[PDB]
Scaffold this active site. Structure first.
Site, PDB file in Angstrom:
ATOM      1  N   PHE A  27       0.861  -1.074  -0.315  1.00 26.14           N
ATOM      2  CA  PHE A  27       0.009   0.073  -0.080  1.00 26.14           C
ATOM      3  C   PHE A  27       0.986   0.732   0.329  1.00 26.14           C
ATOM      4  CE2 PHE A  27      -4.686  -1.941   1.775  1.00 26.14           C
ATOM      5  CZ  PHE A  27      -4.333  -2.465   0.571  1.00 26.14           C
ATOM      6  N   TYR A  49      11.611  -4.952  -2.737  1.00 27.87           N
ATOM      7  CA  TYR A  49      10.867  -6.544  -2.420  1.00 27.87           C
ATOM      8  C   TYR A  49      10.361  -6.686  -3.805  1.00 27.87           C
ATOM      9  CZ  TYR A  49      10.351  -4.725   2.294  1.00 27.87           C
ATOM     10  OH  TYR A  49      10.138  -4.262   3.618  1.00 27.87           O
ATOM     11  N   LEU A 187       2.345 -13.444   2.641  1.00 26.50           N
ATOM     12  CA  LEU A 187       3.883 -13.410   2.824  1.00 26.50           C
ATOM     13  C   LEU A 187       3.782 -11.956   2.125  1.00 26.50           C
ATOM     14  CD1 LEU A 187       5.329 -16.078   0.839  1.00 26.50           C
ATOM     15  CD2 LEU A 187       4.730 -16.380   2.985  1.00 26.50           C
ATOM     16  N   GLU A 220       4.392 -13.214  14.703  1.00 21.71           N
ATOM     17  CA  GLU A 220       3.480 -12.107  13.496  1.00 21.71           C
ATOM     18  C   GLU A 220       3.186 -12.037  12.803  1.00 21.71           C
ATOM     19  OE1 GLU A 220       5.943  -9.209  13.525  1.00 21.71           O
ATOM     20  OE2 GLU A 220       7.330 -10.477  15.455  1.00 21.71           O
TER      21      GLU A 220
END
Length: 286
Positions: A27, A49, A187, A220
């Site tokens: 986002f 990423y 993920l 997490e």
């Protein structure tokens, strides 16, 4: 056949099969931070990423890999995203504005009523007058145009924006890709695949990442595995989400729901619950 247990209850290990799609999320608060024609997802050496997402897609050639995105992207960014889909047969860009999450909404006014009764149901001088006034004023100020929890969160541009819609996407779980099957493997983009996942198992079809680094142990939200859409442990999390207007950071509606679902209380054994819930994979560096 195969079962595990926690807190004196037995649960089936359930299969997360080889067609379960993989979902990543990005986002973007500031789409102006990218050069013309680049995909507006970070791809630096420190945070590569986009490369990690494509690496997973190349490795998992028979699964659908999704990228759940949101932000005020330009036409030129929409073009780049579209090129990414084109270069990879199994990659799908999923824009938050195109997904219908409306089944998971609640009206803001309903939330305020609940919050207000509860405040009103307090002993004579335990009442918080300062809070009630504010809550009542906030309730008066809601239009019917804007009377949706989802609309409010969609206008946000911070971390709460991300988490709120992650939780919804985990509930959709594979319906979001509307070959692909019905669960979802969620993920973080900093996770690196080094081989195929294969068939995975989880208790009642749900697992979460447990970080054991630094000789300490912490659940997490960075990877979550679900075997079906609208998983009940997540619907529990949706109730927590529905009970607040502006949840504070670290309220952790998601975490809370899963723990509630397995009756993991603040008095239970934390290490045991970590062993139980963990998603761990030899082919993923988490």
């Amino acid at each position: 056949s195969q079962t595990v247990s926690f807190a004196g209850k037995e649960y089936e290990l359930k299969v997360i099969d080889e067609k379960t799609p993989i979902l990543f999320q990005w986002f973007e608060p500031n789409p102006e931070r990218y050069k013309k024609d680049e995909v507006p997802i970070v791809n630096t050496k420190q945070h590569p990423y986009l490369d990690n997402v494509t690496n997973a897609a190349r490795i998992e050639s028979d699964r659908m890999i999704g990228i759940f995105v949101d932000g005020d992207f330009s036409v030129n960014q929409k073009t780049a995203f579209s090129k990414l889909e084109r270069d990879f047969e199994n990659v799908m860009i999923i824009y938050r504005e195109d997904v219908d999450f409306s089944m998971y909404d609640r009206k803001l006014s309903d939330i305020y009523h609940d919050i207000i009764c509860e405040q009103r149901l307090r002993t004579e001088d335990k009442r918080d007058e300062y809070l009630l006034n504010l809550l009542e004023k906030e309730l008066r100020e809601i239009s019917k145009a804007q009377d949706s929890l989802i609309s409010m969160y969609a206008k946000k541009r911070n971390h709460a924006w991300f988490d709120f819609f992650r939780n919804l996407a985990l509930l959709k779980a594979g319906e979001i890709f509307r070959s692909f099957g019905e669960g979802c493997i969620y993920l973080d983009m900093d996770m690196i695949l080094t081989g195929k996942l294969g068939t995975i198992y989880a208790p009642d079809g749900i697992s979460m990442h447990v970080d054991r680094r630094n000789d300490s142990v912490n659940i997490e939200n960075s990877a979550i595995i679900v075997n079906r859409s609208n998983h009940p442990a997540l619907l529990e999390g949706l109730s927590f989400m529905h009970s607040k207007v502006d949840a504070h950071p670290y309220y952790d509606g998601l975490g809370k729901g899963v723990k509630k679902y397995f009756n993991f209380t603040p008095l239970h054994n934390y290490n045991h619950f970590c062993d139980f819930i963990e998603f761990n994979h030899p082919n993923i560096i988490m």
